[PDB]
Amino acid sequence: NSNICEVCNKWGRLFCCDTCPRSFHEHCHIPSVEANKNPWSCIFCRIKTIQERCPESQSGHQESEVLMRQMLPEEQLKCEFLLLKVYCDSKSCFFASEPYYNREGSQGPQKPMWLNKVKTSLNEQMYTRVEGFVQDMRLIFHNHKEFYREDKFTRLGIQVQDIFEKNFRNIFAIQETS
Ligand SMILES: [Zn+2]
Ligand SMILES: [Zn+2]
Ligand SMILES: [Zn+2]
């Protein structure tokens, strides 16, 4: 196994996957690393299994169909994994915890959103369709862009949105287009 957390790239109290070399902090893994379970397989491994069980699941899909899917166990897991891929980028720090808004010439968003709130909502099974999860993720970056206006800090929202969207297209096998 690796000697650093796959998510945050720090050492510490690490749980090791039994089927690949990755390791995790308890609350860095999504879902949080399970109490017992020997062997234990990490979310990367569980996603790879889904793909292997149904190779056709990698054929192209339309986004509109993916969004309307109900949050059955496999879609729950895919959302968890997509959330985790965003936390994997260090720039996710800016979007993890509850924001506050007090900048001359700007007004805060009507509906604040942040990664830890999405993580709690997934954990509590609050989303009934993929669309709910995706809407809240895209809302994080849209709120940021609107609030920061012409400040160059707006770019952080563009950057982490790009990581979200690339991973969304990969995990849900969105049909490639020009
Ligand atoms: Zn970690
Ligand atoms: Zn693994
Ligand atoms: Zn199949």
Author numbering: 701 to 878
Paper text:
In this work, we show that unencumbered views of the changed, non-ground state can be obtained by recasting the problem as a multi-data set, 3D background-correction problem, which allows the relevant signal to be extracted from conventional single-data set density. Our new method—Pan-Dataset Density Analysis (PanDDA)—comprises: the characterization of a set of related crystallographic data sets of the same crystal form; the identification of (binding) events; and the subtraction of ground state density to reveal clear density for events. We demonstrate the power of the method by applying it to the most demanding type of changed-state study, namely crystallographic fragment screening, which attempts to observe in electron density the rare and often low occupancy binding events that occur when a relatively large (200–1,000) library of weak-binding ‘fragment' compounds (150–300 Da, 100 μM–10 mM)1819 are added individually or as cocktails to a series of equivalent crystals. Applied to a series of fragment screens, PanDDA yielded markedly more hits than manual inspection of density, far more quickly and all with high confidence, in both known binding sites and new allosteric sites.
